[PDB]
Amino acid sequence: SGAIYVGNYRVVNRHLATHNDWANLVWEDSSRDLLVSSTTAQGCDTIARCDCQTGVYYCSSRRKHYPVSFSKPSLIFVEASEYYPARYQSHLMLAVGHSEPGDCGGILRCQHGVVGIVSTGGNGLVGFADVRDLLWLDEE
Ligand SMILES: COc1cccc(NC(=O)N2CCC[C@H](C(N)=O)C2)c1Cl
Ligand SMILES: [Zn+2]
């Protein structure tokens, strides 16, 4: 579990969105595993606007933040889960690291701010849904 709180927005993995998130929907994209809902309180996270390929992510299954090198946002095949059939997920970045299902929502960050959130994992790999191209998160 986990979310990004920037301005009056809450950014969560679409497969973990609550009824309240769907009832206060701003934007959602199944192909990216993202959903954004509106909030009453202002958040403190800042979104990175950069092309960093190194950062640090939070792993709930180890209570630890790990430094990692990660690939550029791309279209990657993800195996069938209980939330999605086997499909191509877009705007996904891969890194070597520990990840279990419940690790989704963990923040990945660089020197400029929040880069994305854990979305996939498995066999010594961890996937992140990129948010740096969503410029509208910084306004309205
Ligand atoms: C023990 O680690 C494993 C082993 C096998 C599969 C997975 N689960 C995923 O990667 N997810 C599930 C949620 C939905 C994601 C998605 N964005 O499609 C995929 C993990 Cl983390
Ligand atoms: Zn950066």
From Swiss-Prot:
Active site: H15, D33, C104
Positions bound to Zn(2+) 1: C50, C52, C110, H112
Name the record gives this protein: Protease 2A
Source species: Coxsackievirus A16 (strain G-10)
Reaction(s) the record says it catalyses: Selective cleavage of Tyr-|-Gly bond in the picornavirus polyprotein
Function: Cysteine protease that cleaves viral polyprotein and specific host proteins. It is responsible for the autocatalytic cleavage between the P1 and P2 regions, which is the first cleavage occurring in the polyprotein. Also cleaves the host translation initiation factor EIF4G1, in order to shut down the capped cellular mRNA translation. Inhibits the host nucleus-cytoplasm protein and RNA trafficking by cleaving host members of the nuclear pores. Counteracts stress granule formation probably by antagonizing its assembly or promoting its dissassembly.
Residue numbers of the full-length protein present here: 869 to 1008 of 2193
Subunit structure and binding partners: Homodimer.
